Amino acid sequence: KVFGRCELAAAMKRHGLDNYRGYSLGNWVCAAKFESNFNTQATNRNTDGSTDYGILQINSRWWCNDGRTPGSRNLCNIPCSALLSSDITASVNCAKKIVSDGNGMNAWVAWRNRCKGTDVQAWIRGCRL
Ligand code: NA
């Protein structure tokens, strides 16, 4: 599923991401835009052989099991394919654990390089939220 901007904002708000650990909703929509272009089916391989999955590009090195990342962890206790679903529940619940791990949203390289320090509230402008 490719989400609309306000559609994703509304679903993220309903799942409790607005101001989660102090990050306003615009931060999460900005992160999703530059991580996956709002596409739940996005995948990208990393140099170490791990793979990033879903709308927030969650990494199999630490967070999910894809059966092809030996020696890795599965801290969200999910198969990585669950992160590709049109239902974003698993992605959001895993993201909540990531952002709580001490580095905040700096865990997402696209957020640090393209969202941090910008007017992130622009990403929810116009939405009925
Ligand atoms: Na893993």
Swiss-Prot record:
Keyword presence, Secreted: yes
InterPro entries for this protein: Glyco_hydro_22, Glyco_hydro_22_CS, Glyco_hydro_22_lys, Lysozyme-like_dom_sf
E.C. code: 3.2.1.17
Coiled coil location: none
SMART domains referenced in this protein's UniProt entry, alphabetically: LYZ1 (SM00263)
GO molecular function: beta-N-acetylglucosaminidase activity; identical protein binding; lysozyme activity
Gene Ontology biological-process entries: cell wall macromolecule catabolic process; defense response to bacterium; defense response to Gram-negative bacterium; defense response to Gram-positive bacterium; killing of cells of another organism
Tissues showing expression: In the egg white and polymorphonuclear leukocytes.
Residue ranges occupied by any C-type lysozyme domain in the UniProt entry: 1-129
Location in the cell: Secreted
Highest taxon, organism lineage: Eukaryota
Residues where substrate binds: D101
Catalytic reaction(s) noted: Hydrolysis of (1->4)-beta-linkages between N-acetylmuramic acid and N-acetyl-D-glucosamine residues in a peptidoglycan and between N-acetyl-D-glucosamine residues in chitodextrins
A Gene Ontology term for the protein's cellular component: cytoplasm
Protein name, per record: Lysozyme C
Function: Lysozymes have primarily a bacteriolytic function; those in tissues and body fluids are associated with the monocyte-macrophage system and enhance the activity of immunoagents. Has bacteriolytic activity against M.luteus.
Other notes: Lysozyme C is capable of both hydrolysis and transglycosylation; it also shows a slight esterase activity. It acts rapidly on both peptide-substituted and unsubstituted peptidoglycan, and slowly on chitin oligosaccharides.
Protein family (similarity comment): Belongs to the glycosyl hydrolase 22 family.
Gene: LYZ
Keyword Disulfide bond tagged: yes
